[PDB]
A paper describes a structure:
The Hermes DNA transposon is a member of the eukaryotic hAT superfamily, and its transposase forms a ring-shaped tetramer of dimers. Architecturally, the Hermes transposase is unusual as it spontaneously forms a ring-shaped tetramer of dimers. All hAT transposases are predicted to contain an N-terminal BED zinc-finger domain organized around a conserved CCHH or CCHC motif that coordinates Zn2+13, but no structural information is available for Hermes as the constructs used in previous structural work lacked the first 78 amino acids.
As we were unable to generate interpretable cryo-EM data for a single Hermes assembly that bound one LE and RE transposon end at the same time, we determined the structure of the transpososome bound to two REs. The 3D class that refined best clearly showed 5’-flanks synapsed in the top A1/A2 dimer revealing two parallel DNAs. In marked contrast to the LE-LE transpososome, none of the refined 3D classes showed density corresponding to either free or bound BED domains. The 3’-ends of 8 + RE-TIR + 30 DNAs were both inserted in the C1/C2 dimer in a TIR-like fashion, suggesting that this interaction was not a function of STR/BED interactions, but a possible consequence of the particular length of the DNA used. The cryo-EM structure of the core of the RE-RE transpososome showed that the RE does not interact with any BED domain, suggesting that RE binding relies on the interaction of its TIR with one dimer in the octamer, perhaps aided by nonspecific contributions from dimer C across the octamer. By contrast, the right-end is bound to no BED domains at all.
Numbering used by the authors:
A (entry chain C): 81 to 462, 518 to 609
B (entry chain D): 81 to 462, 513 to 609
Write the structure that this text describes.
DNA sequence: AGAGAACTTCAACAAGCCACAGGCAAACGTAAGCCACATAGATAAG
DNA sequence: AGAGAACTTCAACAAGCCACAGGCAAACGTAAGCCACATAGATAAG
């Protein structure tokens, strides 16, 4: 049970040996820090101890094809083994899910994201079922649902309407998912509404044009080396694409203004206002933290919806320090939010926020709809229920910086039989498909020019095993 | 020398746990196949036996920055230890170096490439020295000269008369190299000649874009799934893409014609005469074999370009069934050869081809010029039918007749001919160590691309330079 | 030339106690300056 | 009462020889997948 520290001589031998390895095989440096690699260290040490130093190492080495075959097989056995746990989680309505479709840049396959979210014990579950490519049939949503049910049948799950789905507004996706409770992706809604608000205000375009010319010059003239922070592009696919350029402008301000002064580019900066930049940064920092709080995986994010409304309507409300253009922007933002966000928000969002222990947030008319939905869900999952609802109205809870609604409800689960189960059912719902596009990002990470011959089954096997190893290993 | 065996259960758990690691680490399956991999495994097994089982790993395994420090230290140690042998190679007049420029695609740095080749003992050493940054200077021949002097003085080299260069016709390239040896790149010149040949024949202009649009239609519309040898686009930055794409289209002709029949787009393929395609492939087969001949490094390639001139003039000889368009193409190709190839040739290639044991092939003024050049060099490097003298060495080598054996390698032939012709053999080992073109530079760039990656940004230039140098050293001095 | 066997007579060593003080000899204290590997932050690709 | 010391007799009895029955782990030929490595080969990119 006690590790035996060795003399530094074997240590130096290890250092030189691994330097030779890293140079010869030409691998990224951090691969030594891989925890699985450290497990390899333990395994080879023990086999050396139990067989000596006069062994045949080579015959113990398998072939990579056998590696791939064993990977796919073990994927099959482990997915079969966890099918039972997933079915148990689904039956009690404890599970939610998000989906999307992904494409690479080499073969352009129609890969679909299948992620299942729920909660077990005191760890918030979040599972990636598998990325199955649709192949090439006109990318029809009919084939999408066919392959979807093929995926679900791999775990013996044939019911979907009870699963709560948080997805964006893809036409075919929403068309097919109208049979399911469709929740708009809060992050995607924020990005789209922000883009709509920006496109309604040309009064920022002229400094935007100047900044775009600045960044083009920076990526062209090759002068980023003397900034300590290289300028970034927009990349509209990137979330909060304006925030990154606002940062790379305001933060680098001193160095960039000095180098444009010393490079004879005073023309590039005569059309820029600092006050507007600082006001917009002060407005957009809240938006960035809304993004990060709505992209939380190991924490519930559906309870953020109405506090997000409060924070936005406080931020978007006109102030004294705004310009006429900025006040016009704020009015446009108010119009867009009232026609999109609150228009599309519905009973699920307010009800999921309601279970937060300070239930005095929405003392307005929304309590009626929230109570009706709570009664319906109590029937679905079924001290009395309405008595529970009334006694919850008697509860007052003080916020603390480390307070969690989940632990609070579970410690009140001893007092409340089924409303706590309702809370965990609602708390297991992220407010966005951030996990879905992160799965897409991971798939992009595993794909590369040298990896253009991979098979789809191998890919979804790898990602499922990675998710299982992340979530159910202690 | 006997080796032992483990239980099958041990092998099974090895499979299980290595799969666990690789799925956790998300690494390509080629990693286990590495030779350094099994080297480290053997070291681990030896240490585990020597130390037991309840031996800690966490303390033993170092930190990545420690690794970078140790790699730089080992690189500089090998630099110091090998600079002396490399200097001996420098003044043994058998050294060949590569020079080029390359820009990154993430940070867009400017890098000057220097490597070195030499022959010692029964092996041709191929060492990649360094791809050093030019910082952000004006990128002139002065910065290039400073960088190359710094590169070589890092290995205690200050004179560059003996070194022999092969490179392209860049502006700075022709600007700086006027003071030392210069040879034009065979690959760059060959690609330029192919582009000229296809440009000067107007009749074959439209099939190029026709085939490119065919590939584009089969690409963008997700039309590559049922194609056995799927088509790909040009990527003209590469070498002879057009012929390879045409070959692939000719290969898949059956699939594509039935696909057009089933899809009602037969008008896409009916616009091209197939006989044109067979004519193109029949002409270009010898060209592609020449392509594959010139790229050799572990075997000589400088000397195998004039016999490629022989092969071209054999191919460029007029045919009977060649269309008038094909006759125009071949006449234009002959003109391009006359105006480019012999224009860019130097005495290096003639001297390299001369050492072919049946020297009777080039019995012209060429061998006389080669004799004068070799006599000058040997007077610098130092009828009597015994070798005795360099002039008599050439006189005796002239009359030699050797069979065209199929498995003939001139390397060991001259190695055992050094007993007969010592100084001429030294000239041979000097000449053969020169690749004809700069394909090694692109190989080094490919290695860099294996190093530099979208996720592998933000690496110091000295670090990567040491990595590539040490890797080349190991591929030079490890048995 | 035996042979066993016990006896005074010197008188002659000798193992067996102490007294004790003088090493060299194993092992524990500071100190100690070169390392040098371990510990937290920006930062580009995303 | 006792001495200490050699013969004399059955004697039986616990050491070694012997070696046909009954028994057993060890060795060998066979056969069924079998199945996990091992081979080239191609296929894209670079």
């Amino acid at each position: 049970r006690e590790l035996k520290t060795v003399s530094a001589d074997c240590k130096k031998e290890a250092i030189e040996k691994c330097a030779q390895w890293v140079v010869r095989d030409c691998r990224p440096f951090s691969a030594v820090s891989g925890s699985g690699f450290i497990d390899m260290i333990k395994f080879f040490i023990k086999v050396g101890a139990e067989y000596g130093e006069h062994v045949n190492v080579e015959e113990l080495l398998p072939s990579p094809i056998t590696l791939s075959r064993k990977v796919t097989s073990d994927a099959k056995e482990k997915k079969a083994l966890i099918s039972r746990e997933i079915k148990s989680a689904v039956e009690k309505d404890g599970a939610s899910a998000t989906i999307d479709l992904w494409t690479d840049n080499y073969i352009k396959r129609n890969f679909l994201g299948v992620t299942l979210h729920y909660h077990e014990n005191n760890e918030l579950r979040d599972l990636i079922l598998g990325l199955k490519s649709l192949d090439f049939e006109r990318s029809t949503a009919e084939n999408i649902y066919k392959k979807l049910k093929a995926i679900f049948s791999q775990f013996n799950v044939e019911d979907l309407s009870s699963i709560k789905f948080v997805t964006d507004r893809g036409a075919n996706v929403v068309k097919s998912l109208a049979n399911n409770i469709r929740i708009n992706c809060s992050s995607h809604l924020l990005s789209n509404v922000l883009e709509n608000s920006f496109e309604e205000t040309p009064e920022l375009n002229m400094p935007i044009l100047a900044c775009k010319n600045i960044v083009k010059y920076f990526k062209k003239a090759n002068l980023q080396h003397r900034l300590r922070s290289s300028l970034k592009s927009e990349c509209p696919t990137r979330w909060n694409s304006t925030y990154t350029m606002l940062r790379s402008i305001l933060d680098n301000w001193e160095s960039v203004i000095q180098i444009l002064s010393e490079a004879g580019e005073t023309q590039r900066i005569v059309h820029i206002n600092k006050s507007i930049i600082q006001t917009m940064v002060n407005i957009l920092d809240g938006f960035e933290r809304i993004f990060k709080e709505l992209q939380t995986c190991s924490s519930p994010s559906l309870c953020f919806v109405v506090p997000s409304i409060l924070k936005v309507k406080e931020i978007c409300s006109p102030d004294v320090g705004d310009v006429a253009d900025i006040a016009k922007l704020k009015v446009n933002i108010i119009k867009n939010v009232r026609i999109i966000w609150e228009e599309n928000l519905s009973i699920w969002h307010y009800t999921a926020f309601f279970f937060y222990p300070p239930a005095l947030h929405m003392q307005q008319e929304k309590v009626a709809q929230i109570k009706e939905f709570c009664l319906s869900k109590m029937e679905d999952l079924e001290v009395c229920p309405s008595d529970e609802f009334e006694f919850y109205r008697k509860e007052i809870v003080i916020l603390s910086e480390d307070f969690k609604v989940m632990e609070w409800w579970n410690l009140n689960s001893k007092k409340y039989p089924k409303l706590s189960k309702l809370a965990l059912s609602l708390l297991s719902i992220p407010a966005s498909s951030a996990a879905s596009e992160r799965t897409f990002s991971l798939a992009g990470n595993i794909i590369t020019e040298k990896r253009n011959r991979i098979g789809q089954q191998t890919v979804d096997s790898l990602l499922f095993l990675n998710s299982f190893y992340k979530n159910f290993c202690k």
